[PDB]
Design an enzyme around this catalytic site. Structure first.
Site: not given
Ligand SMILES: CC(C)[C@H](C)c1[nH]c2ccc(-c3ccccc3)cc2c1CC(P(=O)(O)O)P(=O)(O)O
Ligand SMILES: CC(C)[C@H](C)c1[nH]c2ccc(-c3ccccc3)cc2c1CC(P(=O)(O)O)P(=O)(O)O
Lengths: 341, 341
Positions: A98, A234
């Site tokens: 990217d 997201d």
């Molecule tokens: C902190 C919040 C503002 C954000 C929207 C969030 N919400 C979540 C809900 C579930 C999870 C998750 C749980 C288990 C496996 C994978 C993801 C990650 C995020 C995340 C973080 C995600 P993101 O950075 O949103 O894609 P990460 O890839 O784990 O860093």
């Protein structure tokens, strides 16, 4: 929730040690093993560890408490770290593809002076580390082959998803006839949902002696649906989220992303609106990004999202009701709580 | 020898079919599977197939003839094609990292208009195809796990070798204090000899029910030594070979390679010669490449090589004498004949 995270991170030090013990067992490859250490340290640390931690949490919720000795718990942490290594492999490589500048608030690995396209081989090493840890810690366990196959399959699914995404959304070439809902869901399922949600719970399941095809399919149905909403949320937050709450200041629109938002927009747009999108989507200028974002709000995409999050949450609760058994519903509800917070 | 090669190539058509059958089983990912097909066809065809064919030849020489039914032979061809896919994965990725222009006489995959750095994900797919074929064809066989581990380990060894090489010989930075004999042998062993010589014979061994640690170690000793001479001979021929006999017109010296030749040169050079090397090695200009090549001939490197090939052949014959049993010596002698031709 986040006391367990400090414990997960403290385990990294041992993962690194056992993977770079060859620094003196074969002296010749010492310098390469030193480089592997630097790759591990730069690229496996700095994330939120949600995927790896899910392995540990789900393991502890699935196993009978008097089969949770020190060695079991250690295998669970190690397999969590494997999921994190898989994530690290994908992110290093995706950043190169990217042309990204930063990741997890720091310069991307490949942008570091002296790395450059050598990061391609660094990423392959990170991948390879998964199978070295599986062998080191899990080779005598009855689920060994099951985990190797699960990590291989999760890598394939993710790569295929990436292919689909690359074909759908090539940078510097706007073609919105590509950005259909069926295509969006397909990208999300393969590129994100399988490795992010199915992989860690399935791994915990295999470690708990839960190997049945049917149970894996049931859990997969719940988890891929959750993964779909995770990515949609997201996409929404990329543009509409508070940046001191997300961390992101979004660039989906500039990057010609097949976002849930552009998909929704396209479904609702008049031809005059389709034109505004065509002329402003996938370009660098701020005033052009303003245009798209204004179009999104005019079509009430935030109201659509909020509604969609409600219908989605009810549906996930119903899937849990129908497909969780005989797993404890807490395995899935913990994830639902984080995602729908 | 090369009637078997036409047969190997004709089997590719089925490998491609079974790997891209998902074009209609899941329709959503069709376009990605079409891209996978194009990746397979462009990058797995056009080589000499020596590594894959070695699996088939060695299999037929190791197995009892009334356990060579149609399905056995098919698994052997498939596993040969796996070794070729592993090779294809390494070459696509190496070409990107080295900024090469051509491969197997055609434009490198990543240089094709429209591919570019997307080739990184194409390479990962090629790798993933190995484990999809193993599962499709070999999952019920007693050697399944052994082969998966052998391909994973061969990938790690190769990647580690590539790391070592990248540290040793970074383009556009001449440092000959790096180019020592111990380092050269280490690069060759990890980056080339393991996957090129150990991998295909070991795979044939596992398929023949030969799984013993000791036998694998014995064969490895022979095969890594052969691999060392193969690369040394490749290095020599790069500069001194007849190009209508090799195909190559060499660029090791321009590319700042840790060649056997520069290693030998450095061992023999006066300080005034070390200087000529320092000023001319690893540069584009023809007159500068002439200088190095003149230095090589002044130090009688071709005479050193010829002597080294003689001592090497005797040593390989002795290793075969000592370590081939209980394998038939023909398994190793077939390779010796090709290498020392
Ligand atoms: C902190 C919040 C503002 C954000 C929207 C969030 N919400 C979540 C809900 C579930 C999870 C998750 C749980 C288990 C496996 C994978 C993801 C990650 C995020 C995340 C973080 C995600 P993101 O950075 O949103 O894609 P990460 O890839 O784990 O860093
Ligand atoms: C054709 C010869 C002029 C050339 C020097 C040669 N000699 C070989 C001897 C043995 C093998 C081989 C046999 C089994 C496994 C791997 C390599 C390949 C070559 C090759 C071809 C090699 P090369 O192109 O020399 O590195 P390839 O990588 O198989 O294409």
């Amino acid at each position: 929730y986040a006391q367990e995270k400090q414990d997960f991170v403290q385990h990294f030090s041992q993962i690194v040690r056992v993977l770079t013990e060859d620094e003196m067992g074969h002296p010749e490859i010492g310098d390469a093993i030193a480089r592997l250490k630097e790759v591990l340290e730069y690229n496996a640390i700095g994330g939120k560890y949600n995927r790896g931690l899910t392995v540990v949490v789900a393991f502890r919720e699935l196993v009978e408490p008097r089969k949770q000795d020190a060695d079991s718990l250690q295998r669970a942490w190690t397999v969590g770290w494997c999921v994190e290594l898989l994530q690290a492999f994908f992110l290093v490589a995706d950043d190169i593809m990217d042309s990204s500048l930063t990741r997890r608030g720091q310069i991307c690995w490949y942008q570091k002076p002296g790395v450059g396209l050598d990061a391609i081989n660094d990423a392959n090493l990170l991948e390879a580390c998964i199978y070295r840890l599986l062998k080191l810690y899990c080779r005598e366990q009855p689920y060994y082959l099951n985990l190797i196959e699960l990590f291989l399959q999760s890598s394939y699914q993710t790569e295929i998803g990436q292919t689909l995404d690359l074909l759908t959304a090539p940078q510097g070439n706007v073609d919105l006839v590509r950005f259909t809902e069926k295509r969006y869901k397909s990208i999300v399922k393969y590129k994100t949902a399988f490795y992010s949600f199915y992989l860690p719970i399935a791994a915990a399941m295999y470690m708990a002696g839960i190997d049945g095809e049917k149970e894996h399919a049931n859990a997969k149905k719940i988890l891929l649906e959750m993964g779909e909403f995770f990515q949609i949320q997201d996409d929404y937050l990329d543009l509409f989220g508070d940046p001191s709450v997300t961390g992101k200041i979004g660039t989906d629109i500039q990057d010609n992303k097949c976002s849930w938002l552009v998909v929704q927009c396209l479904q609702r747009a008049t031809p005059e609106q389709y034109q505004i999108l065509k002329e402003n989507y996938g370009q660098k200028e701020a005033e052009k990004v303003a245009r798209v974002k204004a179009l999104y709000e005019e079509l009430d995409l935030p109201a659509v999202f909020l509604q969609y999050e409600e219908d989605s949450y009810s549906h996930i609760m119903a899937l849990i009701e129908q497909y969780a058994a005989p797993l404890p519903p807490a395995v899935f509800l913990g994830l639902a709580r984080k995602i729908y917070k």
